[PDB]
Amino acid sequence: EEITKDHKVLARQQLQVLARYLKMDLDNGERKFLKEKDTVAELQAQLDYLNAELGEFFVN
Amino acid sequence: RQQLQVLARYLKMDLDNGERKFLKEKDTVAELQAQLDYLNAELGEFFVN
Amino acid sequence: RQQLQVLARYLKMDLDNGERKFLKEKDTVAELQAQLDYLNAELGEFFVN
């Protein structure tokens, strides 16, 4: 199992070198996703406050 | 780029997973924003604030 | 160069071992030369030869 680990580490480092040469950020998508998930929780919190204030019967 | 694609395929790593999740999250945001916008058009800003 | 560095790291090969040893040897040379120079300044060239 260690041989596979060594080869995977080498391949990952080669891919990292290639990405650095290509000037491509591999974590841009995850960064944006995490920002969007935070915006969702903010909006959900606003909606939850309005439903706790007005009630479900009124809001629906 | 093709060499990097080959390496990613060998490593079983999806390079577009983050963008896929980001686009799903952006759609959820617009849904929630639309609900909030309807409630503000119904109650008005003075009441909601 | 970065690809070659990655390959060397995978092969567990030190690329600067030779230069390290060379620099140690050059220092040993200067120590021995200094001893010889002191003995020649003490005895003189006519006696030493």
Residue B7 lies in a domain: yes
Helical residues (DSSP H) of chain C, grouped into ranges? 2-11, 17-43, 45-48
**Residues A44, A48, A51: CA angle, nearest 5 degrees:** 140
Cβ neighbours for A12, distance < 8 A, ≥ 6 positions apart: B7, B11
Domain of C17: which CATH number? 6.10.250.1930
Residue B14 lies in a domain: yes
Range of the domain at B25: 1-44
Spell B34-49 as b/e; 16+ CB within 10 A means b. Answer: ebbeebeeebeeeeee
Cβ neighbours for A27, distance < 8 A, ≥ 6 positions apart: B18
* Residue C36 identity (one-letter amino acid): L
Residue A60 lies in a domain: no
Calpha distance C28→C17 (Å, rounded): 17
Residue B49 lies in a domain: no
- List chain A residues with CB under 8 Å of B15: 26
Calpha distance A7→C21 (Å, rounded): 31
Header resolution in angstroms = 2.3
- List chain A residues with CB under 8 Å of C7: 10
Residue C19 lies in a domain: yes
Residue A39 lies in a domain: yes
| Distance from the A2 Cα atom to the nearest Cα atom in chain B, whole angstroms | 16
